[PDB]
Amino acid sequence: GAMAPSYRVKRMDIAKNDEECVVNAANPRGLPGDGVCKAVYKKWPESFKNSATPVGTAKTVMCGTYPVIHAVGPNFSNYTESEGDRELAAAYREVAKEVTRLGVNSVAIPLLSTGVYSGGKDRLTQSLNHLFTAMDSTDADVVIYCRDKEWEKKISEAIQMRT
Numbered sequence: 186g187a188m189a190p191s192y193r194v195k196r197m198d199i200a201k202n203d204e205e206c207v208v209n210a211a212n213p214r215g216l217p218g219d220g221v222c223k224a225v226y227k228k229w230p231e232s233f234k235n236s237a238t239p240v241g242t243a244k245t246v247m248c249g250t251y252p253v254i255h256a257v258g259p260n261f262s263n264y265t266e267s268e269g270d271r272e273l274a275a276a277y278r279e280v281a282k283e284v285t286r287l288g289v290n291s292v293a294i295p296l297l298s299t300g301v302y303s304g305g306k307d308r309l310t311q312s313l314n315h316l317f318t319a320m321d322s323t324d325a326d327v328v329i330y331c332r333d334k335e336w337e338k339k340i341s342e343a344i345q346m347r348t
């Protein structure tokens with residue numbers, strides 16, 4: 186574990202993270218995809234061997250000794266708000282299990298289902314709160330990666346609020 190486990194946020198490409206492992210915002214079929222998933226495919230292509238996994242689950246594949254945790258959030262175009270919310274909460278619990286099993290002291294994580302799986306809605310608060318619910322009982326340093334300046338401010342505010 187980290188000596189004083191923390192949350193931080195950075196506005197940059199998760200493929201350039203400074204953490205001991207990465208969470209991919211994966212699709213269920215282990216395809217290169219777009220956004221975070223395409224950047225992860227270009228940086229750690231070996232991690233996409235047998236990475237396919239259902240919605241609401243996480244499956245880790247090593248690229249050398251560097252763990253890539255493929256987490257499949259729901260596509261809110263396809264799910265009801267209720268079922269999508271349940272699967273988004275489940276994906277993050279599976280991420281906490283994997284981070285714990287790996288024994289890492291740090292993890293780089295994107296906000297699941299906030300991009301092309303958002304169903305055109307702002308899900309910053311919904312996705313971040315499910316991230317906190319899952320990761321608060323872990324002792325890894327968590328670094329959240331985002332791309333938008335307004336999102337960075339709102340994530341930073343939510344972290345600082347809890348102290």
Ligand SMILES: NC(=O)c1cnccn1
Nearest residue numbers: 296299300331332333336
């Ligand atoms: N996570 C992000 O960087 C982000 C930015 N703008 C909309 C949705 N997600």
Ligand SMILES: [Cl-]
Nearest residue numbers: 196197198201
């Ligand atoms: Cl960058």
Ligand SMILES: [Cl-]
Nearest residue numbers: 298300301302
């Ligand atoms: Cl997404």
